[PDB]
Design a binder for this molecule. Structure first.
Ligand SMILES: Cc1cc2nc3c(=O)[nH]c(=O)nc-3n(C[C@H](O)[C@H](O)[C@H](O)COP(=O)(O)O)c2cc1C
Ligand SMILES: Cc1cc2nc3c(=O)[nH]c(=O)nc-3n(C[C@H](O)[C@H](O)[C@H](O)COP(=O)(O)O)c2cc1C
Ligand SMILES: O=C(O)c1[nH]c(=O)[nH]c(=O)c1Cl
Ligand SMILES: O=C(O)c1[nH]c(=O)[nH]c(=O)c1Cl
Lengths: 313, 313
């Protein structure tokens, strides 16, 4: 029985990795994720220049999940590029680098510099088209013309296989249109579904207050709140992008939740809120728990059940 | 201390009502909702002609909420209009009638016949712009040009105060645009936030199967999954539509959940999934619970705290 995968010309011990943004902003965080049992890791979404992000409190967690408006705090592209070029031990596991420029121009400037490092070292680009937490900057992937422009310009400037981090959609016509946009771009080899469910609002009854300071308390939701939304978008894109990989993200706390993602079509399975709350020991637990489910069902590999969710009638 | 309030030139005993679609399809249902301790009721969204709806199983509930793809099954507008005109006891509580035509023309046809009964009896119109479950008919209010056309045509045909059932939005630009569209129409006097979070997907691990039959398992989500999204929308619209009422719907299971909706800005509070699961006895419990929270905090009235959610700095 086996959790190994081979995709995008890399080998993975298992499908689990962090979700972008969680346990991946500093050199310390990246070494920690590397030292963990995860199959891979992804760096914090970066901008050309360092950012402090939004004021605190900007993340909070609860039984059912998390709310965040971090504001894209990061050490800047130069640092994550250096990590990829000089510091990361690729003998341990594959590295993804998340880029989240605030304009098409900033993304193109970054990917131009990334390309030689991707060629040399095999770092993989995840292009973030879904941040929901920087004031005055709606999600790029909710404007399909903007999305197309970003992908055209990035494809042209980068010229190498990459993937995209997508927001959740909630309308079949939006699935149809977004997947069709993506399918215009052959270099988009993977689609990560989903970013946080945007602009929710958690309120504390005792204090009568919102629980995060930025944006009058509005922030992206993760965790148990979003699992069926996540599974829906995984499956929607799995069905609509038969020539691409889909990576699942949203609501993973157990091997069973990972199993659902995989049934829905996920290749890699990313872990955000639960990893933030539990720490990197979660990866051994998720591995054991997925293996257990597979043993009980007689499944020997992930491809025996990936995308094999049954519909009724 | 009593929870009674006045809104829309009607008196209500308390702010509680069913969510449209739940316990409101048949004469029996509507008599039961009338007999309950809810402050008001709303009928099942109706079409000009009767509809059987989508195939079964089409609703399923779980500890964290529900998924449904009912497909607008209803007895037909003639039945709901006759209920409003001839059967409902207005001495017990106000009645809202929900219309959900599948085209602008269908909605106009219904509201032209509703108008005289609204003038005579005081039944209130809730225009449903957010059904996520009829194949090929995406949510009207996710197309702002379409939403504008519907609201121009209904306002012209109806000529009387009405309200609108909105989908959840997840992007600040969408809140800004949607509220500005609503604010173009002075006859829109209430905004109900939210309909189900569209097109989620629940999968059962043991069977490896989706749990509802229509649309390959995709359906709208209600219940605990959606409370922070519902609160966000209620507050977003409460902030942006200062001359309209906001009715809250989504994730209400307790008096505390109702207290948060009201803090976010809700005037009425609708109960879907929890009502479907618990039955109409839920209304006495919610009232007892909300009163108890009010007492412990020293609130005498709902107005003292409606919309008075605190932000940080
Ligand atoms: C603290 C925090 C930071 C995040 N930062 C990023 C990020 O930099 N880039 C990104 O694509 N998504 C980011 N996300 C979104 C997560 O990658 C993930 O898509 C989302 O939390 C849903 O997964 P979950 O339910 O496991 O939390 C962040 C989430 C959290 C909670
Ligand atoms: C079985 C079912 C039927 C529904 N039918 C309607 C409907 O006819 N019209 C409508 O506007 N909303 C309908 N909804 C949405 C609910 O009114 C409500 O907006 C949603 O369920 C979220 O509230 P909740 O979290 O309390 O369930 C329906 C929901 C369910 C569960
Ligand atoms: O605020 C963040 O930093 C953040 N938070 C999110 O939930 N998703 C994102 O893509 C980002 Cl970039
Ligand atoms: O499928 C339904 O009938 C239904 N279900 C919902 O969750 N919202 C609606 O507006 C409708 Cl009309």
């Amino acid at each position: 029985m086996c959790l190994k995968l081979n995709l995008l010309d890399h080998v993975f011990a298992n499908p689990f990795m962090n979700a972008a943004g969680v346990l991946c902003s500093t050199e310390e965080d990246l070494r920690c994720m590397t030292a963990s049992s995860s199959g891979a890791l992804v760096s914090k979404s970066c901008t050309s220049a360092p950012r402090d992000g939004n004021p605190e409190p900007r993340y909070m967690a609860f039984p059912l999940g998390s709310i965040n408006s971090m504001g894209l705090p990061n050490l800047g592209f130069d640092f994550y590029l250096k990590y990829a070029s000089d510091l990361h031990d690729y003998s341990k596991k594959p590295l993804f680098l998340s880029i989240s420029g605030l304009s098409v121009e900033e993304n193109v400037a970054m990917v131009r510099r990334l390309a030689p490092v991707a060629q040399e070292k095999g770092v993989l680009l995840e292009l973030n088209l879904s941040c929901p937490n920087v004031p005055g900057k709606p999600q790029v992937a909710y404007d399909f013309e903007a999305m197309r422009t970003y992908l055209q310009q990035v494809s042209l400037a980068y010229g190498l296989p990459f993937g995209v981090k997508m927001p959740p959609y909630f309308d079949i016509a939006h699935f149809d249109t977004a997947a069709a946009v993506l399918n215009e771009f052959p270099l988009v080899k993977f689609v990560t579904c989903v970013n946080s469910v945007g602009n929710g609002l958690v309120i504390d009854a005792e204090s009568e207050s919102v629980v995060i300071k930025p944006k009058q308390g509005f922030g992206g939701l993760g965790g148990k709140y979003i699992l069926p939304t996540a599974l829906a978008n995984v499956n929607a894109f799995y069905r609509r992008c038969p020539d691409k990989l889909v990576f699942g993200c949203g609501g993973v706390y157990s091997g069973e939740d990972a199993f659902l993602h995989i049934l829905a079509g996920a290749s890699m399975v990313q872990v955000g809120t639960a990893l933030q709350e539990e720490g990197p020991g979660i990866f051994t637990r998720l591995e054991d728990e997925l293996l257990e489910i597979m043993a009980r069902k007689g499944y020997r590999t992930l491809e025996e059940f990936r995308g094999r969710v049954k519909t009724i009638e």
